[PDB]
Structures are given as C-alpha cells and as structure tokens.
Amino acid sequence: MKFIKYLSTAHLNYMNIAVYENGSKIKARVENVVNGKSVGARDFDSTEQLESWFYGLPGSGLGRIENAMNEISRRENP
C-alpha cells in the first residue's frame, strides 16, 4: 500500500526493513523479499523521523539495518 524505497541493501537475513508509506503515518514493516511473511512493524511519523532514529541506532553500516531490525521486531505498537 503506497510503497517506497528500502533501508540500504537488504539482506543479511533475506530480511529487510522495507519502509512504505501510509496516507498519514508511515509503516516500517520488517519483512522478507521472498514469499512475503513479515515480522512486527512499527507505525510513526514521516520519513524525516525514519532517517533520524534510523541513524540514531548504534553500529556502523549494515549493523544499523540489523539493530534496526531487532529494534522493530520487539515492537510496542500494534
């Protein structure tokens, strides 16, 4: 639903962050790129926050994708 770009060269698990927009919020549905079954997402404000807390996570380079993936998969927001 109103799909946009990824976060920077998945994979490393066949898992991806796969940010895509909603009409008001933006969902960050951590998912595969094969058959399609995701793990837990998180809904929040626009891309301007998405790059902000995405850059606000530790590690360098690919570890930001991975620590972002573990950070979203233990979600609070249903």
Binding site: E48, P58, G59, S60, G61, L62, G63
Partner: protein, 326 residues
Amino acid sequence: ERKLDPSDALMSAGAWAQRDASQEWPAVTVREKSVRGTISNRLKTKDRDPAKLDASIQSPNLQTVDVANLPSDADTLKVRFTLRVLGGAGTPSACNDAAYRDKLLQTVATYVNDQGFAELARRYAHNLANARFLWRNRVGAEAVEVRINHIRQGEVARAWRFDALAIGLRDFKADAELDALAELIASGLSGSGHVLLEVVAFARIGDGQEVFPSQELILDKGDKKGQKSKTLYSVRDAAAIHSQKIGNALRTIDTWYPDEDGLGPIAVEPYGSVTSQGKAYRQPKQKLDFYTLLDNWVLRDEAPAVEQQHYVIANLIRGGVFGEAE
C-alpha cells in the same frame, strides 16, 4: 496437468574450491611448491569526507566540524610480499555430474520431465560451446576478480589430475583473451571437451588451477571481504575483514562461482557490452540491475515454467540450463 514443482532444488554441479593466494617470482614460476602464503595484514586508516551529503534538511555549519574531523578506523588490507612479483590462486574446481538430476523432487512427474530436458538439451545441443562458455569466459581469468586489473601477464595453469599424478596439463596467458567475447582457441576447445567429459558424466574431474598474476611487488589485492554484522561493537575497530584460510587469504567460493557463472550475453538489453553471471533473474550485484526482469521472458524461472509445458526456448535454453548447472 504436469504442474511445476512445489519445492525443487538442484545440486551445484561444476563445483568450486577456495583460493589460497601465495606469492612468487617469475622464472621461479614453475617451482610453486614452497611459495609462502600472504597473511592478511592490518593497516590503520584516518578517514576523510568524500561522501555526498543529504539535500532535504540541513545546516551548513555541520560540515565544518564533520569535514574537519577524522572518523578514523582500522582496515585489514591484505598486502603482498616485499620482493615478490607474481601471485597465486590455487583452486581445484571439480565438476559434478548430473546436469539436471535434482536434489529435491516435490513431484516425480516433473523430475521425469526435467530428466527428459537434460536428455534433450544434452542430446541435441552438444556441450561443446556450452563448456566453451564455462572455459573461454573463465580461462580468461575472471577467476582472479579485482586483482585482474592491470596485470603484466596473468598466467593460468589449469593442471588436471586423476590422482597424485596429473595428465591434462594446459597452460595459458589470460591477458590474450577478452572478457566480452569468446574467441576461437584450440586448447580452450580441449578444456571444453574435458568439461564435456565432466557435465555429461564421463569421468572424475577436478581441475587444479594455479593462476599467476605477474603484476608487481608490494601492491594491494582484491581478497574476499568478510562482514561486520554484530562484530563492529565488541571489537568496533576493523571495517574490512579479509577472510582467511588456515594462515592465508581466501577468495570465498561465493565470489568464485560468478567467475565461472559469468556465462551468458544472452540477456535482454546488451549485445557485446555486458556478460553477466548466469543466474535466476540474471541479477548482477554490482550494478543493482535486473537484467531479464519479470516482465521480460529470459528468466530462469520462466525457462522450465515455459519449457516444462511447451518445449520452446530455442537456444536461450543455455541461459536456462546453466541456471540449473549452478
């Protein structure tokens, strides 16, 4: 009637070993026995800022301190010896049999079909020019990947051994062979006659390769990097782990397969420009391209998806059978 397999999977026939780089001097080329391996050294870098910055929302004083400072880090760059001119890559690629005999058979009728298609494309289409793709675009040493760049003379010595004894002893000069078009070579037709004797299940074949890039002294390399996933926090120093065998420098078999999986200029777009690695979805990892996209019909996953029903691909079969060789 005769639907596709629910879960098919094929063994990587035409397998591939690891490389152990080790450095030598010419006219001591023949005596590569006591040739010492090349340990992955550890340089320690101080950075700069060559990366472009964002265009959405900024403040122009950030690059004064950022472009000022030094985000310095250690990089384990594998470096040659001091007084060694040559190089080394010892890989026994052994070719398995059974070009399309599967490893998983989620429907046996589809297995009888695919064995019928190895019977057709191995009976009708002879594997002369097929293994001439797996040799004339892998003797021209795409084996040596980034270290091929500006060699004096990168010599490939594909020895071949029954046993401790070795009979097929073919020698080359891989700078006299292109990487965009396969040209007519007699000894390349001997080696492709030998992979003819490999993929069509004739003999035990393990090709001990000894590639000698004669580049220079202490210059860098292109050894296969490891990763820094959840290890850039405990150590938090290295940023490029050149992977190791026991005391040497690898080339991971993962990189080493598209040395020889680079087969087909049988793609959608190019003519004599790009000879990519023959894959399902034909995707190269460099360019972030998808040659042979879904909307085109040059997929591997449309080659039995059409050939298992209607038997017509007509010599793009090779980029739909070599997708099954590996």
